[PDB]
Design a binder for this molecule. Sequence first.
Ligand SMILES: O=C(O)C1=C(C(=O)Nc2sc3c(c2-c2nc(C4CC4)no2)CCCC3)CCOC1
Length: 130
Amino acid sequence: DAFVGTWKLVSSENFDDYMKELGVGFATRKMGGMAKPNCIISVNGDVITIKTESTLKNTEISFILGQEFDEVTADDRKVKSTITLDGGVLVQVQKWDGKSTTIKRKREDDKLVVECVMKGVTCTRVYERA
Ligand SMILES: O=C(O)C1=C(C(=O)Nc2sc3c(c2-c2nc(C4CC4)no2)CCCC3)CCOC1
């Protein structure tokens, strides 16, 4: 939809702090910190796919809005995830071990803006079309 495309990361703020707040170790935060992934969003029928592609690691999720799914994250958490569309924003929550984190994806002008929150840490990542 408004989201469908191939997106390339152009800016990131507070991502190391976000990863730290989630308990991610040094080696994975080192891989994530200066990675500039592509995010490939597609839709077919009920099913949305989001691929995150980067030199040292690729991940993918496919889901139906409102339907919880199991996800293995890039930092190897086993989480339960639910994604909904609220006011044009794709809102993802991941739940594990009594914890939660949100990843919100929105379109603003030419940007795909991704806000990641864990506790008191807010990270913002900005993608532009490839
Ligand atoms: O911008 C995005 O799509 C988002 C995320 C993302 O790109 N994460 C990447 S790309 C990447 C790596 C990680 C990574 N994340 C984590 C923890 C934070 C979750 N540990 O490693 C590690 C291996 C190299 C490539 C995560 C938050 O949701 C939005």
